[PDB]
Amino acid sequence: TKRERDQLYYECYSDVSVHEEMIADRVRTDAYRLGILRNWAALRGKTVLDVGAGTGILSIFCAQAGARRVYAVEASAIWQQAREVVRFNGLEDRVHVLPGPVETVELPEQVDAIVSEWMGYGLLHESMLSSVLHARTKWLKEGGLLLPASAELFIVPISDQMLEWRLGFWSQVKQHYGVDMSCLEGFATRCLMGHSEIVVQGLSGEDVLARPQRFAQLELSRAGLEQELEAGVGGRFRCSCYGSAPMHGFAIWFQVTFPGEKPLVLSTSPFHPATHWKQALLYLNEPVQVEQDTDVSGEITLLPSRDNPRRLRVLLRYKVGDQEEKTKDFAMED
Amino acid sequence: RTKRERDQLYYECYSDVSVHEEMIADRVRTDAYRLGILRNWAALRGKTVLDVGAGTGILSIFCAQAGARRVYAVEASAIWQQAREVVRFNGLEDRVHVLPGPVETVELPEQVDAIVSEWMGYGLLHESMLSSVLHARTKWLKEGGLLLPASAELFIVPISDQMLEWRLGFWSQVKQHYGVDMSCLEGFATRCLMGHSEIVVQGLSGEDVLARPQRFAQLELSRAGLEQELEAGVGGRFRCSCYGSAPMHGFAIWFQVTFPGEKPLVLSTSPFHPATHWKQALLYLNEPVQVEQDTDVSGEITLLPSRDNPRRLRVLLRYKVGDQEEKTKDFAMED
Ligand SMILES: C[C@H](N)C(=O)Nc1ccc2n[nH]c(-c3cccc(S(=O)(=O)N(C)C)c3)c2c1
Ligand SMILES: C[C@H](N)C(=O)Nc1ccc2n[nH]c(-c3cccc(S(=O)(=O)N(C)C)c3)c2c1
Ligand SMILES: Nc1ncnc2c1ncn2[C@@H]1O[C@H](CSCC[C@H](N)C(=O)O)[C@@H](O)[C@H]1O
Ligand SMILES: Nc1ncnc2c1ncn2[C@@H]1O[C@H](CSCC[C@H](N)C(=O)O)[C@@H](O)[C@H]1O
CATH class of the missing domain: 2.70.160.11 (Hnrnp arginine n-methyltransferase1)
Known part of the structure; x- marks a missing residue:
């Protein structure tokens, strides 16, 4: 059943271990930091949707590149740790953690950019790319930036x-x-x-x-x-x-x-x-x-x-x- | 969560190669039993042995090498088929008899002079296999019989x-x-x-x-x-x-x-x-x-x-x- 499958899937991401693993992955985490900082021109003063913000680290990289506002959407209970991290880095006013699926969340506006680390084993394990593409259709302005592209x-x-x-x-x-x-x-x-x-x-x-x-x-x-x-x-x-x-x-x-x-x-x-x-x-x-x-x-x-x-x-x-x-x-x- | 369901899930771990590779690759464990068995040649030479959970049959073969005349290799998982082949291939199929099924229910033709078993789980007692070894001691080990380890x-x-x-x-x-x-x-x-x-x-x-x-x-x-x-x-x-x-x-x-x-x-x-x-x-x-x-x-x-x-x-x-x-x-x- 969908309800059961989602709850079981999001259970993985409510635990510390996979986020420790992802942020300890320097190749992965440096790649997103540099991808974001190198797109400063397109982000500075602009709005960003982080699809599956997890502990919030990529949303904070977007804030640090000078995005005016970042919607950090996270469907798992880890959204509470993302809120605590954003408050703890003094960015409450620029990064807004929104609990729940990206498919059903309500952003106040459409966004200039989407950032997401959606890739699973074999690229497409977890099928997260569908959620990114759903967000693109529904929340990204014509011409908006996709990170990665x-x-x-x-x-x-x-x-x-x-x-x-x-x-x-x-x-x-x-x-x-x-x-x-x-x-x-x-x-x-x-x-x-x-x-x-x-x-x-x-x-x-x-x-x-x-x-x-x-x-x-x-x-x-x-x-x-x-x-x-x-x-x-x-x-x-x-x-x-x-x-x-x-x-x-x-x-x-x-x-x-x-x-x-x-x-x-x-x-x-x-x-x-x-x-x-x-x-x-x-x-x-x-x-x-x-x-x-x-x-x-x-x-x-x-x-x-x-x-x-x-x-x-x-x-x-x-x-x-x-x-x-x-x-x-x-x-x-x- | 029936007994027959819990058993078939437990023994399905042992019917796969990975655990037996891990155990046999554990030199400390496997050398301890080789040495512990061969050191005990005296009480084993010409004697009957029960191997409780023989797995790939290795310890049953150490006992035959130690000079045992007859070893019963009891194994409840599907790995008993791999033990039968290992015994056959080492030319020991007249001294080592692989008997399929739980030690609680299998038929030996006789009481034995020794039990050998590698029953130990994580924290010693995870898997609760000591219970099966003790069932087999009570039921099949002769008075004054030998237990490896003790x-x-x-x-x-x-x-x-x-x-x-x-x-x-x-x-x-x-x-x-x-x-x-x-x-x-x-x-x-x-x-x-x-x-x-x-x-x-x-x-x-x-x-x-x-x-x-x-x-x-x-x-x-x-x-x-x-x-x-x-x-x-x-x-x-x-x-x-x-x-x-x-x-x-x-x-x-x-x-x-x-x-x-x-x-x-x-x-x-x-x-x-x-x-x-x-x-x-x-x-x-x-x-x-x-x-x-x-x-x-x-x-x-x-x-x-x-x-x-x-x-x-x-x-x-x-x-x-x-x-x-x-x-x-x-x-x-x-x-
Ligand atoms: C999508 C994202 N970008 C990503 O890299 N996710 C990661 C990152 C690190 C992982 N370490 N283990 C896992 C993992 C382990 C077992 C089961 C599964 S799952 O069935 O796909 N699931 C999420 C419940 C995943 C990780 C998943
Ligand atoms: C008792 C014997 N002497 C022994 O050491 N057994 C070992 C040896 C190596 C193992 N590697 N992993 C496991 C293991 C992995 C997952 C689940 C379990 S379990 O619940 O206890 N089970 C058997 C179904 C056990 C091993 C068990
Ligand atoms: N449809 C969806 N809506 C919202 N979040 C989702 C989602 N599908 C997956 N997620 C979340 O996306 C995250 C992907 S892991 C990446 C986390 C973080 N952006 C980082 O780079 O470290 C997980 O926390 C998972 O719960
Ligand atoms: N009650 C029981 N009756 C028979 N075999 C059992 C049993 N409980 C566990 N076993 C089996 O006992 C083995 C223990 S682990 C493998 C031991 C093997 N003799 C070796 O040292 O390499 C497993 O193969 C498991 O399937």
């Missing part, structure tokens, strides 16, 4: 170092304890790779087996986008492996772009500094060995789950070299 | 969790990195991280320990009314004296278990010993208390099963810190 999604075949050690563990028992358990490699593979869950795990550049491929671009200003999101977003990809590796499946990640000076990009690439998002891993049922110039192709759609519209679903089709086309349907882990 | 001890000490101290202080550091003062959120963070009634499993070290650890219970597995003690709740009074000035966050408990020898082998989960998968079980007060050198800390702790889930550890804590009034807190193992 766009998002891009990337895919690449990976060999996951940590998964490889966990799979290989059972073959090393004999050397450690004088019992041969190498026969549980099959079992370990079914348990760790044969599930249909998206796995959130940080990779390094060494886990990446080809040139990453962009499979989608979301321009938040593009009319049509709400409908695209419920249809599902994605496309085809093609790439060539660098070398011999046990391929475990694919990583997807995203970046978002603030307008500038010059445009600031917040990346969640494994080639770039770690963020709380890590990457979203799509494991094959078992490893497939690949080689220099092995062709990996397929097609991916990100769409909301039927039973929970905040639950990211990934439909993957893929071909590794001369192995036949396969299909796998993933849902975000609990 | 005893367990519970320990308690006031702690100043350096990790929690960092997390509570985090909101005071926001102004320095980002130019926003969020120091006013310390109270909120304290309510969230300390104000709940969950036992937190977390690895401490000496720097976290505020006093001499106190033993608050000794479980001799051979002792008669132990099952009844477990139902009533095991525990006892404790008192200690703080080492220095510190924000006290609460208590850590841990356990060791002892195998008979050589000398007796002690598997310890103390924060002063090498790290295990069990770590320590943390009991936080609702908020920090400032203690000083020689600040007196005392109370009484009971460990017992929860009412709704009998496999869920509950801790009743009564404590007093200096001249603050006695307080009470009732903890249940985190899910």
